[PDB]
Amino acid sequence: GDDRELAILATAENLLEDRPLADISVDDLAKGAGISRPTFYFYFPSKEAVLLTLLDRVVNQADMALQTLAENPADTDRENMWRTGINVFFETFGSHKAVTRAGQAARATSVEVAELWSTFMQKWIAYTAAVIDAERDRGAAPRTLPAHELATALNLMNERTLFASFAGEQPSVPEARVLDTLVHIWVTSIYGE
Amino acid sequence: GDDRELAILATAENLLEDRPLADISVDDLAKGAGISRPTFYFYFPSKEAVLLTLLDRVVNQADMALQTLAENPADTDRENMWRTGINVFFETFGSHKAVTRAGQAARATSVEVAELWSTFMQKWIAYTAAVIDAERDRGAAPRTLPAHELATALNLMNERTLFASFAGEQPSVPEARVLDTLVHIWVTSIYGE
Ligand SMILES: O=C(CC[C@H]1CCOC1)N1CCCC1
Ligand SMILES: O=C(CC[C@H]1CCOC1)N1CCCC1
Fold this sequence. Notes:
Two copies of one chain form a homodimer.
Chain A: H1 2-16, H2 26-33, H3 37-43, H4 47-71, H5 78-94, H6 97-106, H7 111-137, H8 147-166, H9 175-191
Helix pairs in contact in A: 1-2, 1-4, 4-5, 4-6, 4-7, 5-8, 5-9, 7-8, 8-9
Bound molecules: 3-[(3S)-oxolan-3-yl]-1-(pyrrolidin-1-yl)propan-1-one (2 copies).
PDB class: transcription
Keywords: EthR, transcription
Assembly: dimeric
């Protein structure tokens, strides 16, 4: 039951490494999971629903990892604190490049994918703005831009730059350089007067 | 001749304000430009080709405006210099939101659109990195990240943040706040040690 479901998810993640959602059939997903086509339809209404679940799992893994960090502050300076936080996204989505890529393409077509992404983006920007505000209240960061607008641009930067690096787009920051590049911009723009 | 072509371009830009490329037909473009369907095909091979031309004109208008600026340095401090430069993109693409939006959607499907965007992105990042390097050589900016990697992330930020503001995405920086937000991040990340 849960195993047929996991099998179908594992198949879809594997096939998405080699071709886009468009070039993958329900029959393809069913064959790789070792079930028939009508059995597939019992677990998922469509291949698009399979992607939505895969994306949902990846987004929540990142979200849970960031909640863990939040509850367990690393004992280090502020630059390393922000690095650990962006690193949750670098590692989680970078461990699932095929779902990340397909998920991002699906935002244009699936209101469900668009809404899932928008909900968690709002959550991560609000957390980012809360930390900036705490830093300002403690006197560690200067009161420059509206924290929530600063947070929005910096999370949008990370979305676009990480995902270009992972896809090897032209142009992109090499993946072995993207964490340091983003940490620099976050730290200078948050602490710089 | 050039007028039928301009008519078709003007129609397509007008229709793109109200619905996406998918929901617009060749017959729709032909009717609005006051020509028949086979006459349309004489000027453009497809509605996708019409979008490519519209995007091409918008990208080159921005590129030419930025070349003008480059050749005619504004007499003001460095923060206002970067503001004038990002402002070329804020005004040019913000004056053509429907083409911007459709152009960005078309990157997923049209290799021509993808290649046009990637070529000019490379050009603007190289110009951005050249200015940062000049600033470092004159001693006005510190030698922190690789200028070209810094330039790449900051231009990717502007692409994603401007285009979210213009589309009124959730989340986004309000359009009346996006120029100040981006100038802050560029200035702190370029000059900050
Ligand atoms: O890198 C980040 C988030 C950055 C972390 C760093 C501390 O707060 C959020 N994102 C990319 C995908 C969406 C958000
Ligand atoms: O804002 C910018 C470019 C910023 C200017 C500012 C000085 O050099 C480039 N872009 C958004 C669309 C692509 C690039």
